Design a protein around this ligand. Structure first.
Ligand code: HEM
Ligand code: HEM
Ligand SMILES: Cc1cc(N)nc(COC[C@@H](CN)OCc2cc(C)cc(N)n2)c1
Ligand SMILES: Cc1cc(N)nc(COC[C@@H](CN)OCc2cc(C)cc(N)n2)c1
Ligand SMILES: C[C@H](O)[C@H](O)[C@H]1CNc2nc(N)[nH]c(=O)c2N1
Ligand SMILES: C[C@H](O)[C@H](O)[C@H]1CNc2nc(N)[nH]c(=O)c2N1
Ligand SMILES: [Zn+2]
Lengths: 405, 405
């Protein structure tokens, strides 16, 4: 049965028929819904061959060459290669198509209106951690573009049965160190305590600030990972100030321009790319709300509230809500002043609604994870709060994978 | 680990396993292939007896007499009563237990810390629409308690074979009229256009303000509903003012004190109580964010932002977030001044976390609907945002039921 999908603000209804193309189970069953879980609990040639075929058909259908001689030959090549070797390789154009499709298919991404605009760097001819680093630098340079951010993905060599994976150990290309204190607390970003320690242990001389950019740990197959410091000119950062509260800059806050996820696996036609870092630009609440105000992150709400002279003694003064708004405002203002691409949560969710509509017409649905699409402040002030969403796994897909240590 | 859903709190790093979901006898709308968790409404003989037996088992467990002679005799009583009449009836203490458990079971309610403290009015002797009105007036008086609100449910006679249902047509005991205008817009609450026009069709002389309290449409078995005006002195309202924005009072906004849901079905041991209105006290975001700021409700955000002199021509000023905060603050401040019970979304979610811990120890889990539990402003500023939740249906339950017309 196909799900009826209602928008509660507009009263309009659609039917999701795309979910029928799902070949992979999510975490839910009729007995209990596990939609709010962040990670999956659970984290032969004929099965590879059927994923490969399905993906090749997706590709030829996308270039409107479905059933062509080019199409049939390509399927025979894939078939001949799997049968002899247990695996196959993608053509660059297939890889490019596959990577845009994985982004398109990502249920947690609110930025999917952009999905067709993705620079794909083919790095499958990489043979060493040293080469990975060079590719990573070029990616950063290209994606940053002096503040005019451009979406990009770099795809390192696929996993192969006989050997270790290419991996970037860091969860993002740009991350701030978190230094555990003898007295339990953390200096820097508490989310990065473990990777910070791994870096030091692999030879990095640590800093002692709140915002020390981490080096990269890059791993070529079956080798210890190697440490690479990113050249500071590569990492564009925006100092945070507020349009009207002058003390705000005194807080010494800053964030980096480029959000670039580097720990996720890219799956295309049954092939798996364990190192395929991708990047776009930030939505302001990621920084203003989560990274700065989460209690297990920089946790600056109290500091800001004290500075704004708010009554911190009672929740009902809504001091938290008031401080968060100003912090988000500071992020938006500072990124705009520095001329660095950023989108606020109102503009982002409005674009996502238009994306849902485009996708309804093009594919008969759009997989979306409501808990992730709705922003972490002002939920119901955005149109996506009132929109029902169906969540399911299509391939090509970005997936979580185990930490390599 | 254990073969039960693993539930993580991402703020604290702590893990639990939900074993209570095992007690679910009723399927939700999710499958392995697609999650329908964000959908607001997803679409007897031996059947009764097994629901009855299971409920009677729950009752005897809760008073610690499982397997006792009194437990076995009640079981026998129930099957005999069904055997000869097709239905059965609850003892008074069974009803009280079942009503409390219905509330304890409600996955969408953030106020369940209070579940044990529920006044159950037994109105199973009611035989007319006039008497329903008297009971409902008594309920409102008791629950309102001049501003010191008290949780209550009033239970009218159950569905019976052949015979028509007791129904309250209104969705809440207190609702404001919504009058469709010539220009196509609505004066009052647009959520209530249909019930308003039904009240007129049944002979109510309509008012024409933004905050006209609706009469009740009450239906006794096999009769047309009858119209009842609530005496104005029984309906406590709170005029809205802001602690520092002196003009806010001039907007003439107000809300009623008592949230009293009247169109839900209370199901206990297979028995169906089609009229069983229940009330608590408000969480401030229900009024300040949803009822006043939803685009399809009072939709006041822009009017307030304009009075605050915000830049409403650009999303990136965060005018909507700033205005919503002040409206929420005005709600809290005004209820506080008026001495009417209300709870802010920070205190409420903190108490819900406490509830989750109580229920983990008491029953090994707690069914909870994340999208409904997380408040509509300041989501990740509250501890429930960082808490994974397992949603499933337990009985006794409050359930949606079709409109009687
Ligand atoms: C162009 C601007 C983009 C914006 C504004 C954006 C926005 C977002 C946001 C806000 C999230 C949730 C992040 C979080 O809370 O941690 C997200 C998740 C994600 N986005 Fe994007 N996105 C963009 C581009 C991209 C690109 C280029 C890709 C890949 C090609 C991508 C794939 C993803 C994936 C896979 C996730 C899920 C991450 C996870 O499950 O942990 N997005 N997006
Ligand atoms: C004591 C104070 C209470 C508070 C603060 C409270 C809070 C809430 C809130 C905020 C919601 C979601 C409302 C919405 O967005 O529409 C809700 C839903 C609900 N609560 Fe409560 N609650 C309280 C008492 C009660 C009582 C006394 C009962 C019944 C005995 C109850 C049963 C429910 C049910 C069944 C729902 C779900 C309704 C639906 O699905 O539409 N709650 N609660
Ligand atoms: C490409 C992109 C653009 C943009 N604006 N934002 C992002 C967000 O990146 C952070 C995402 C990437 N997995 O992190 C989500 C996450 C996942 C997990 C398992 C844990 C955690 N703390 N956070 C990515
Ligand atoms: C008892 C109680 C306490 C409290 N603080 N809040 C509530 C609010 O309940 C409103 C619920 C009623 N099912 O809202 C869901 C709903 C129902 C209807 C008919 C329309 C609508 N838009 N939304 C109820
Ligand atoms: C438990 C809950 O699912 C978890 O906190 C999720 C909620 N929604 C989110 N949404 C986004 N965009 N990013 C997140 O990290 C989360 N965290
Ligand atoms: C589409 C979505 O399910 C819908 O807007 C829900 C989201 N969460 C909610 N949460 C509560 N408490 N009340 C609501 O009415 C809603 N609406
Ligand atoms: Zn689900």
């Amino acid at each position: 049965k196909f799900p009826r999908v209602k928008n509660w603000e507009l009263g309009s209804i659609t039917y999701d028929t795309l979910c029928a193309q799902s070949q992979q189970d999510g975490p839910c069953t009729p007995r209990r819904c596990l939609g709010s879980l962040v990670l999956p609990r659970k984290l032969p040639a004929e099965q590879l061959l059927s994923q490969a075929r399905d993906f090749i058909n997706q590709y030829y259908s996308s270039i409107k060459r479905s059933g062509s001689q080019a199409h049939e030959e390509r399927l025979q090549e894939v078939e001949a290669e799997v049968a002899s070797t247990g695996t196959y390789h993608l053509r660059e154009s297939e890889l490019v198509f596959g990577a845009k499709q994985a982004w398109r298919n990502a249920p947690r991404c609110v930025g999917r209106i952009q999905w067709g605009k993705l620079q794909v760097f083919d790095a499958r001819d990489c043979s060493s951690a040293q080469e990975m680093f060079t590719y990573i630098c070029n990616h950063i340079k290209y994606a940053t573009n002096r503040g005019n951010l451009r979406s990009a993905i770099t795809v390192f060599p696929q996993r192969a049965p006989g050997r270790g994976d290419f991996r970037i150990w860091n969860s993002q290309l740009v991350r701030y160190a978190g230094y555990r204190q003898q007295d339990g607390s953390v200096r820097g970003d508490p989310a990065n305590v473990e990777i910070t320690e791994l870096c030091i242990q692999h030879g990095w001389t640590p800093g002692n600030g709140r915002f020390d950019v981490l080096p990269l740990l890059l791993q070529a197959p079956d080798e210890a990972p190697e440490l690479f410091v990113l050249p500071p000119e590569l990492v564009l950062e925006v100092p945070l100030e507020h349009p009207t509260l002058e003390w705000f800059a005194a807080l010494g806050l800053r964030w980096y321009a480029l959000p670039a996820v580097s720990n996720m696996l890219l799956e295309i036609g049954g092939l798996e790319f364990s190192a395929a870092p991708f990047s776009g630009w930030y939505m302001s609440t990621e920084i203003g709300t989560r990274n700065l105000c989460d209690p297990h992150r920089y946790n600056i709400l109290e500091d800001v509230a004290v500075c704004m002279d708010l009554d911190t003694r009672t929740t009902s003064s809504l001091w938290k809500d008031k401080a968060a708004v100003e912090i988000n405002l500071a992020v938006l203002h500072s990124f705009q002043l520095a001329k660095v691409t950023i989108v606020d949560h109102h503009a982002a969710t409005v674009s996502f609604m238009k994306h849902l509509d485009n996708e309804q017409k093009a594919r008969g649905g759009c997989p979306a994870d409501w808990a992730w699409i709705v922003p972490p402040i002002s939920g119901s002030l955005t149109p996506v709060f009132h929109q029902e969403m169906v969540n399911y796994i299509l391939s090509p897909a970005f997936r979580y994978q185990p930490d390599p240590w």
